[PDB]
Scaffold this motif. Structure first.
Motif, PDB file in Angstrom:
ATOM      1  N   UNK A  39       0.841  -1.185   0.000  1.00 22.75           N
ATOM      2  CA  UNK A  39       0.000   0.000   0.000  1.00 22.75           C
ATOM      3  C   UNK A  39       0.885   1.248   0.000  1.00 22.75           C
ATOM      4  N   UNK A  40       0.590   2.144  -0.931  1.00 19.97           N
ATOM      5  CA  UNK A  40       1.347   3.378  -1.048  1.00 19.97           C
ATOM      6  C   UNK A  40       0.945   4.328   0.082  1.00 19.97           C
ATOM      7  N   UNK A  41       1.948   4.976   0.653  1.00 18.92           N
ATOM      8  CA  UNK A  41       1.714   5.912   1.740  1.00 18.92           C
ATOM      9  C   UNK A  41       2.395   7.251   1.448  1.00 18.92           C
ATOM     10  N   UNK A  42       2.065   8.237   2.268  1.00 24.07           N
ATOM     11  CA  UNK A  42       2.636   9.563   2.110  1.00 24.07           C
ATOM     12  C   UNK A  42       3.732   9.817   3.148  1.00 24.07           C
ATOM     13  N   UNK A  43       3.543   9.221   4.317  1.00 17.30           N
ATOM     14  CA  UNK A  43       4.504   9.373   5.396  1.00 17.30           C
ATOM     15  C   UNK A  43       5.612   8.325   5.277  1.00 17.30           C
ATOM     16  N   UNK A  44       6.832   8.766   5.547  1.00 18.97           N
ATOM     17  CA  UNK A  44       7.981   7.880   5.473  1.00 18.97           C
ATOM     18  C   UNK A  44       8.104   7.101   6.784  1.00 18.97           C
ATOM     19  N   UNK A  45       7.925   7.821   7.882  1.00 21.54           N
ATOM     20  CA  UNK A  45       8.012   7.212   9.200  1.00 21.54           C
ATOM     21  C   UNK A  45       6.969   6.099   9.312  1.00 21.54           C
ATOM     22  N   UNK A  46       6.005   6.141   8.405  1.00 14.87           N
ATOM     23  CA  UNK A  46       4.946   5.146   8.391  1.00 14.87           C
ATOM     24  C   UNK A  46       5.019   4.347   7.088  1.00 14.87           C
ATOM     25  N   UNK A  47       6.235   3.953   6.740  1.00  9.16           N
ATOM     26  CA  UNK A  47       6.454   3.186   5.526  1.00  9.16           C
ATOM     27  C   UNK A  47       7.497   2.100   5.795  1.00  9.16           C
ATOM     28  N   UNK A  48       7.470   1.076   4.955  1.00 12.28           N
ATOM     29  CA  UNK A  48       8.403  -0.029   5.090  1.00 12.28           C
ATOM     30  C   UNK A  48       9.456   0.037   3.981  1.00 12.28           C
ATOM     31  N   UNK A  49       9.050   0.608   2.857  1.00 12.19           N
ATOM     32  CA  UNK A  49       9.944   0.739   1.719  1.00 12.19           C
ATOM     33  C   UNK A  49       9.850   2.161   1.163  1.00 12.19           C
ATOM     34  N   UNK A  50      10.764   2.469   0.254  1.00 22.75           N
ATOM     35  CA  UNK A  50      10.794   3.784  -0.362  1.00 22.75           C
ATOM     36  C   UNK A  50      11.240   3.625  -1.816  1.00 22.75           C
ATOM     37  N   UNK A  51      10.375   4.064  -2.718  1.00 20.11           N
ATOM     38  CA  UNK A  51      10.667   3.976  -4.139  1.00 20.11           C
ATOM     39  C   UNK A  51      10.940   5.378  -4.687  1.00 20.11           C
ATOM     40  N   UNK A  52      12.220   5.714  -4.751  1.00 16.08           N
ATOM     41  CA  UNK A  52      12.626   7.017  -5.252  1.00 16.08           C
ATOM     42  C   UNK A  52      13.705   6.851  -6.325  1.00 16.08           C
ATOM     43  N   UNK A  53      14.265   7.980  -6.734  1.00 18.28           N
ATOM     44  CA  UNK A  53      15.305   7.974  -7.750  1.00 18.28           C
ATOM     45  C   UNK A  53      16.638   8.426  -7.151  1.00 18.28           C
TER      46      UNK A  53
END
Length: 113
Positions: A39-53
């Motif tokens: 599930x895509x989220x907006x908060x990082x502190x509330x994320x398990x992964x991060x898809x960036x460049x």
């Protein structure tokens, strides 16, 4: 109704975060992360992964900072294309598409895998 469950869901039960601009659109991605079970989220502190460049991780803005704060490994978009079409372990996949140098065992919240 009630049918259609149990399948190939890697991100299944995982909040993925996105930053900067990726090959696909936020939606196209938000869908995937959801299709994989995540599930895509907006908060990082509330994320398990991060898809960036790479650029993003390079920027290290406030957004990316949150990810760095929550020590969330940042991977590329190809990850989604792999996670879906790749019989590799997440851990590996991540390293196989790790854009950041961080994102390891660190004071985390609930939920585990």
């Amino acid at each position: 109704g009630s049918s259609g469950s149990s399948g190939d869901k890697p991100l299944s039960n995982m909040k993925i975060l996105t930053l900067g601009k990726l090959s696909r659109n936020k939606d196209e991605v938000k869908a995937m992360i959801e299709k994989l079970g995540g599930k895509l989220t907006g908060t990082a502190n509330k994320a398990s992964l991060c898809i960036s460049t790479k650029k993003e991780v390079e920027k290290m803005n406030k957004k990316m900072e949150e990810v760095k704060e929550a020590n969330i490994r940042v991977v590329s978009e190809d990850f989604l294309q792999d996670v879906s079409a790749s019989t590799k372990s997440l851990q590996e996949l991540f390293l196989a598409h790790i854009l950041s140098s961080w994102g390891a065992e660190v004071k985390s919240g609930p939920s585990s895998g």
